[PDB]
Design a protein around this ligand. Structure first.
Ligand SMILES: CC1(C)[C@@H]2CC[C@@H](CNCc3ccc(C(=O)NO)cc3)[C@H]1C2
Ligand SMILES: [Cl-]
Ligand SMILES: [K+]
Ligand SMILES: [K+]
Ligand SMILES: [Zn+2]
Length: 353
């Protein structure tokens, strides 16, 4: 009956030495943590310590070469950090980046351990840099290692290889790295909702479309819900949960739920362009709590309006703690999107028929 929370100020040390106004700001996590104190949520949680991921733990999802390259950045002079960052899509690197990425992952491992050992029922991880764009072999989109993917594998590593993990990715961007890491996996169901715009929206790949349903044994275990045609909000996200996320998740019967919880679909976010409310995120969290006997871990991904993300993630933690959720026609293109995913996944999920 207990909610865990992990936060460590040391993850603020990752920074952009060339553009101090880059939106993936150190203050993202400190503003969220402060808001939890202001709302008297922090004192209601069980504090879970951060730790470093080990390199062996990173090898659950990443190549030895990728690990060694990111690790080599901690001793680089600035022009070599610039060159290295430029070898990726939308990455900046400081000497502290690698350690911060390790702390983000190890924090999530400790939270998953706390859940799976029964110390807490659910947990929230206020971490940066984010993870879901990171691939096996490369960094991408502000992400170095795929924290959520690694946490799924870590969870399997302390229970059984086939532990059913559901990852719900409600960051406004597609988690390309998460999709690829689990594309052939039927033990990890990946469900992403994301702005798509026929490939115009970052990370700009048709991999994010609704017809990418997984490969081989994982066919049916990758659910992309792509939005086209501009701003979406609470109605569209509630309908996507109602028609797709929750029926599929209930059929899958996960033993652990991880939320890749970006808050860049929030009202006010300058990169997402969407209008999901803090109350909306509260309802999404409360629905996911009905899964997996409540074993839910909310992991911060993106989200760039400091006030928006502080309010939205605090609302999610309020739901984890058992507070009552707070108090409509869809954009026509959202109906088109939902029906496209429904047709793509009806062959795999009887609940959609
Ligand atoms: C040059 C810039 C720094 C300007 C200000 C934001 C970025 C956005 N370019 C791509 C992008 C978006 C979002 C994420 C993300 O991880 N969101 O969670 C990752 C990558 C470019 C434009
Ligand atoms: Cl330079
Ligand atoms: K997403
Ligand atoms: K999968
Ligand atoms: Zn994002």
């Amino acid at each position: 009956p207990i909610t865990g929370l992990v936060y460590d100020q040391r993850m603020m040390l990752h920074h952009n030495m060339w553009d101090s106004h880059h939106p993936e700001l150190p203050q993202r996590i400190s503003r969220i943590f402060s808001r939890h104190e202001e709302l008297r949520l922090l004192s209601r949680c069980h504090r879970i310590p951060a730790r470093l991921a080990t390199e062996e733990e990173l090898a659950l999802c990443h190549s030895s070469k990728h690990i060694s390259i990111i690790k080599s950045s901690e001793h680089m002079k600035p022009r070599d950090l610039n060159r290295l960052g430029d070898e990726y899509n939308s990455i900046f690197i400081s000497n502290e980046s690698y350690t911060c990425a390790l702390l983000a992952a190890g924090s999530c491992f400790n939270s998953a351990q706390a859940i799976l050992t029964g110390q807490v029922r659910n947990a929230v991880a206020i971490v940066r840099p984010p993870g879901h764009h990171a691939e096996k072999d490369t960094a991408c989109g502000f992400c170095f290692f795929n924290t959520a993917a690694l946490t799924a594998r870590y969870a399997q590593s302390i229970t059984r290889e086939s532990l059913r993990v559901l990852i719900v990715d409600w960051d406004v961007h597609h988690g390309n790295g998460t999709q690829h890491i689990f594309e052939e996996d039927d033990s990890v169901l990946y469900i992403s909702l994301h702005r798509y715009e026929d490939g115009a929206f970052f990370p700009n790949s048709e991999d994010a479309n609704y017809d990418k349903v997984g490969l081989g044994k994982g066919r049916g275990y990758n659910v992309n819900i792509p939005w086209n045609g501009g701003k979406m909000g609470d109605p569209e996200y509630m309908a996507a949960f109602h028609h797709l996320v929750m029926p599929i998740a209930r059929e899958f019967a996960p033993e652990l739920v991880l939320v890749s919880a970006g808050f860049d679909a929030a009202r006010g976010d300058p990169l997402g362009g969407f209008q999901v409310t803090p109350e909306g995120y509260a309802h999404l969290t409360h629905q996911l709590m009905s899964l997996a006997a409540g074993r839910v871990l909310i992991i911060l991904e993106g989200g760039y309006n400091l006030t928006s993300i502080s309010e939205s993630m605090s609302m999610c933690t309020s739901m984890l703690l058992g507070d009552s959720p707070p108090s409509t026609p869809l954009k026509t293109s959202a109906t088109v999107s939902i029906n496209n995913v429904l047709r793509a996944h009806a062959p795999f999920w009887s609940s959609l028929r």
